[PDB]
């Protein structure tokens, strides 16, 4: 922490913090505590749990100088969400970035589950409508072709209200854009990678939720940049 | 025909308000035929719901008991 500090007080830096598994952090805390003597609290841990975790995560936010954003990995006891130690952390978190082992076989990278990730500032008040209104849309749709899937199983591509079709082609172009050239990927692919706006990524989910797309195939949106990097991939099939 | 000194009843397979051609209630017994057949969704709810069915009751409602 405090090495990541210095670059925010000292020289005006964004820095980010990354701690994996925050969670070894209160658990060596109720360890230790039982030696020091303290009373057990609600399941074994520290009666001064929540103190601790706060005194940590306080320090880490944007002076007006600079700022410390931070990802911290948690490890919850046995999925179980009730947990002192889980619980005294969400209590801090500002957004939850979900990567999902199922989006990574279908080859979406990156394997962030389009859904469960949330965000505190994904609020019109904090990004305004276009970013909202695209974003909400952009998960809805993402919802129908979810459900459908059972159905697709079942009555195959014939029927389904001409209309679910529609949203299975945008669905998967969609969930598809939701991919990316990594830059730290060009070692074993060679693709240069790309960093799209928020601004760029906006109007690219616009025009595709608007279907202007609609005659791309599948593979053109599947791993690139902004919505111009989907026309060159595309043309690069063959399309006028 | 039920011709009765007071009434007539017209007995009919399928009947319908139709012009001179006949080879309309055909067209009605088209447009109506494979409109019926499109009533999967009386089958696929069913599905959907066998499915649920088995879908909460694969949590197996019940594990050894309890």
Do not use: C, W
């Not at chain 1, 922490?1 to 210095?6: G, H, K, N, S």
């Not at chain 1, 103190?51 to 919850?76: F, W």
């Not at chain 1, 046995?78 to 990574?104: G, I, M, Q, V």
């Amino acid at each position: 922490l405090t090495m990541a500090e210095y670059f925010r007080d000292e020289q005006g830096q964004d820095v980010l913090l990354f701690i994996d598994n925050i969670f070894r952090f209160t658990q060596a805390g109720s360890e230790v505590s039982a030696l020091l003597g303290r009373m057990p609290s609600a399941v074994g841990y520290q009666p001064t749990l929540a103190t601790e975790m706060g005194q940590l995560q306080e320090r880490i936010t944007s002076t007006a100088k600079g700022s410390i954003t931070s990802i911290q990995a948690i490890y919850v006891p046995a999925d179980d969400y009730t947990d002192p130690a889980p619980a005294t952390t969400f209590s801090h978190l500002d957004a939850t970035t979900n990567l999902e082992r199922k989006l990574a076989e279908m080859g979406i990278y990156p394997a962030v589950d389009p859904l469960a990730s949330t965000s505190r500032a994904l609020a019109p008040e904090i990004v305004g409508e276009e970013h909202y209104q695209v974003a909400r849309k952009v998960q809805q749709t993402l919802q129908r072709y979810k459900e459908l899937q059972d159905i697709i199983a079942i009555l195959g591509m014939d029927e389904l209200s001409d209309e679910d079709k529609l949203v299975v082609h945008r669905a998967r172009r969609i969930q598809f854009f939701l991919s990316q050239n990594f830059h730290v990927a060009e070692q074993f692919t060679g693709q240069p990678g790309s960093y799209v706006p928020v601004k760029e990524t906006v109007r690219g989910f616009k025009e595709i939720l608007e279907g202007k797309y609609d005659h791309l195939p599948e593979d053109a949106f599947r791993l690139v940049g902004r919505i111009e990097e989907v026309v060159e991939k595309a043309k690069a099939m063959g399309v006028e | 025909l039920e011709v009765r000194p007071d009434k007539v009843t017209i007995l009919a397979q399928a009947a319908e308000r139709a012009e001179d051609i006949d080879v309309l209630r055909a067209k009605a017994a088209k447009e109506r035929a494979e409109r019926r057949l499109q009533s999967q969704q009386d089958d696929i709810d069913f599905k959907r719901a066998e499915l649920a069915l088995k879908r909460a009751m694969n949590r197996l409602s019940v594990a050894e008991m309890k």
